Amino acid sequence: MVRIDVISIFPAYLDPIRQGIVSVEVHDLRNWTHDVHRSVDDSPYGGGPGMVMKAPVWGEALDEICSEETLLVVPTPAGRLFDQRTAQRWSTERHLVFACGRYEGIDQRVVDDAARRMRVEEVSIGDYVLNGGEAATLVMVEAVVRLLPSDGLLEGPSYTRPPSWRGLDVPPVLLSGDHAKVAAWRHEQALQRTRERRPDLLD
Amino acid sequence: MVRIDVISIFPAYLDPIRQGIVSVEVHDLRNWTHDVHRSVDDSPYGGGPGMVMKAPVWGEALDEICSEETLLVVPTPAGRLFDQRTAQRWSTERHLVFACGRYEGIDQRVVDDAARRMRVEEVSIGDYVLNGGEAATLVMVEAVVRLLPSDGLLEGPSYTRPPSWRGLDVPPVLLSGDHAKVAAWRHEQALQRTRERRPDLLD
């Protein structure tokens, strides 16, 4: 079984996660503050365009939630790219914890301190800016949980009934179901589409 | 104002979207079926590992929701990569529609038919497999809506109080707040981190 914990200051963002192989629980980071403010952020050393999430609050939260077996994931645009190989690899773990940052991110010593007792990976789901880690966590959790109990080319187009719709016909090779003919046409289609859309996959 | 419509067979997945500049509305694709089954899929022409979403159901739904000004977005792993430039570009539109596919995707003639009357973009948020477009839509909507009323390097680490926590000290240059010194150290840090984590950003 995989146990998954998510720590966020916007726990309600993680409601779709719910939509004995996996266990999920969402935690409000403010539960580990000790002031009337329930403050989780403070000014950046050296100056900066926003606020940085406090290390003591996070340290206390990870002290409680994590053990030596935990794989701590930190969603951040400064991280390594998430991909299908990572999702598969994470699917073999027994405890995943997602630390969702807000504002300009989390004090770096959080990750350094945590790395003393567990494994930590800083990852980005893509080259775009979000308000925080929550949406990225939803994507990575979905990608992992679905793996629980021309491959380098894009998928080509798929078709179903009817054979003709609004003037557009299904390619006849697909209707004349010779397996060799279909596969050849599909590899041609996958090739052209990869060239058109993701030439980097060929370099 | 940007009007955003999302069409899905799992509309409840889009609840966090709610968390006069933007308008959001989620639609259940099954509302445009006309059979007791409320069937949205059928067998793939030429054979395939799963089912393909029907073109008539989708055509009817997009007939109702889209107009000539609509930018139709189709989340799919066969699409162009979503990035920050796309998010900015989409933020200038007046009507975004997200067509969330399930199973092996949507009959390709849906996109071809739609492209007769509107602009259509097939996009992927990253190189990983999800169960459907819904989670990707949450990511792209967040990325766009937040834009409404060493740049090639990763962000380096950020620090806030205290100056020493659990044996780990904030780099002294950040405490000795010379703006020139801070910036130089930060560009060095951003450089090394990009090299370590995303060498492709340098190629």
* Domain CATH number, residue B119: 3.40.1280.10
The first and second tokens of residue B80, run together, are 């162009």
Q: Would you say residue B168 lies in a domain?
A: no
Q: Which residues of chain A have a CB within 8 Å of the CB of B106?
A: 158
**Residue A96 CA: distances (Å) to CA of A9, A61, A89, A109, B127:** 18, 14, 11, 20, 21
Closest partner CB to A125 (pick from B10, B125, B159): B125
Q: Binding residue per annotation — B128? A: yes
Q: Would you say residue B13 lies in a domain?
A: yes
DSSP H or E run through B26: strand B22-28
Domain ranges, residue A17: 2-146
Q: Which residues of chain A have a CB within 8 Å of the CB of B182?
A: 46-47
**Dihedral sign, CA of B89, B91, B94, B98?**
positive
CA torsion A159→A165→A166→A172, rounded to 10°?
70
Closest partner CB to A46 (pick from B126, B155, B174): B174
Residue A5 has what DSSP assignment?
Answer: E
Nearest chain B residue (CA) to A163: B45
- Closest by CA position to A27, among listed A71, A68, A57: A57
Q: Which residues of chain A have a CB within 8 Å of the CB of B146?
A: 129-131
Q: Would you say residue B198 lies in a domain?
A: no
d(CA B161, CA B180): 21
Q: CB distance B77–A182 less than 8 Å?
A: no
Domain count, chain B: 1
Q: CB distance A129–B146 less than 8 Å?
A: yes
Q: How many CB pairs under 8 A join A and B?
A: 240
Q: Would you say residue A187 lies in a domain?
A: no
Q: B121 forms bridges with which residues in the sheet?
A: B73
Q: Would you say residue A41 lies in a domain?
A: yes
d(CA A144, CA A92): 9
Q: CB distance B19–A41 less than 8 Å?
A: no
Cis before A199? omega within 30? no
Residue with tokens 């719910």: A18
Torsions phi, psi for B27 (to 5 deg): -125, 140
Q: Method of determination?
A: X-ray
Whether B6 and B27 have beta carbons less than 8 Å apart is answered as yes
Q: Would you say residue A26 lies in a domain?
A: yes
* DSSP states of B94-109: SEEEEE--BTT-B-HH
Q: Which residues of chain B have a CB within 8 Å of the CB of A81?
A: 126-127, 198
Cis before B157? omega within 30? no
Q: Would you say residue B172 lies in a domain?
A: no
Resolution in Å equals 2.0
Residue with tokens 């990750």: A111
CA torsion A121→A24→A125→A66, rounded to 10°?
-20
Enumerate residues 154 to 173 of chain A having a beta carbon within 8 A of any beta carbon in chain B: 154-163, 165-166, 168, 170, 173
Whether A69 and A94 have beta carbons less than 8 Å apart is answered as yes
Stated length of chain B: 203
Angle, CA B198 vertex, CA B195 and CA B200 arms, to 5°? 95
Whether B96 and B143 have beta carbons less than 8 Å apart is answered as no
Q: Would you say residue A128 lies in a domain?
A: yes
- Closest by CA position to A94, among listed A30, A163, A20, A167: A20
Q: A26 forms bridges with which residues in the sheet?
A: A6
